[PDB]
Amino acid sequence: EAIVNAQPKCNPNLHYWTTQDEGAAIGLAWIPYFGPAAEGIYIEGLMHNQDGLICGLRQLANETTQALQLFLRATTELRTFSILNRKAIDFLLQRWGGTCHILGPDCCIEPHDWTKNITDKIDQIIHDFVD
């Protein structure tokens, strides 16, 4: 599909917060005893609406809600942390879950260099055919 923003408004800027997974290399700050409290682990950034990505993102999050809620209704986990890892697995299973038929539409193996390796080396059997 495509993303059709259909909200009353769009804040075109995303002033965001997040954590850094490897962000306190300075001295002893990585040690929990010395490091920041819960309130001071965030990094900030600002992102503008190049390629309409912010207004798209807002619409995408809105449209994700129905599916997400229905998934949460169906799970017995109290806190769900596995959605992105499960997407990662399903990515791999789509591509690599069966036999990969080379040159078929559902197999991501490029022989491009292996084509011209053999077209190059027929000219040491038909080219080198010396009587």
């Binding site: 769009c10 804040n11 390629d51 999050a61 599916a67 109290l78 769900t80 959605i83 990662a88 197999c107």
Partner: protein
Amino acid sequence: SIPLGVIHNSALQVSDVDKLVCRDKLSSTNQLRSVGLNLEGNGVATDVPSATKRWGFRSGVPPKVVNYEAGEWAENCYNLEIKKPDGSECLPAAPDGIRGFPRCRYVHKVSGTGPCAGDFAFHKEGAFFLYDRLASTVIYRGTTFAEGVVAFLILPQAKKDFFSGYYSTTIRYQATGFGTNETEYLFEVDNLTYVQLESRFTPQFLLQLNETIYTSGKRSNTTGKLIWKVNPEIDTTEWAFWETLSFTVVXXXXXXX
């Protein structure tokens, strides 16, 4: 299936892991992201009266929590301390490890009472309550939250397009008849001085009105409760946040004209 955003032809698109082509590359779990987006940014009314009308109590539905890795700085968050008339708590205590939303310019702390006909409070429009990197389907007692929704993305490997510190201000409210058709709200100046709340009052107007009351000496100077009203003729600011006087007396009601 849960939608998954991806950047194709200089545009965000919905697809999923099943709909991709071999050119699309997921070389690491780092490329996967969950982002929380605030209803604010879609243009919803953020005033306490309008905001609370979106929530409601319901029994039989077990609460659910999903995490999200990054969020948006909010103008408006909310923190609820609601009790029944009998003094029993209407909302559950925050579960272990659920802290409040980390960036709020204004936290609207509403204390009060209501019938609370249901075990848990849900979002009537299906949105989530965003806490610190955890989105719940329900409201926790005394824990700050932003209303919002969650997106999942496959970011690209490198670069994704063509080409002030943190201050939080708490704003206190008294409420009666919470989560009903006849809810009443009072903005709190001190423990004895209040203002009848209306939907048109913005956060900056409330802080300015508060500032004026303290510096004009219009606080209750008795043991009793003083409730100011602002008559219709005083405007306060239909524009979103990112694009933007005398006192006389008549509990103790009063008018600011």
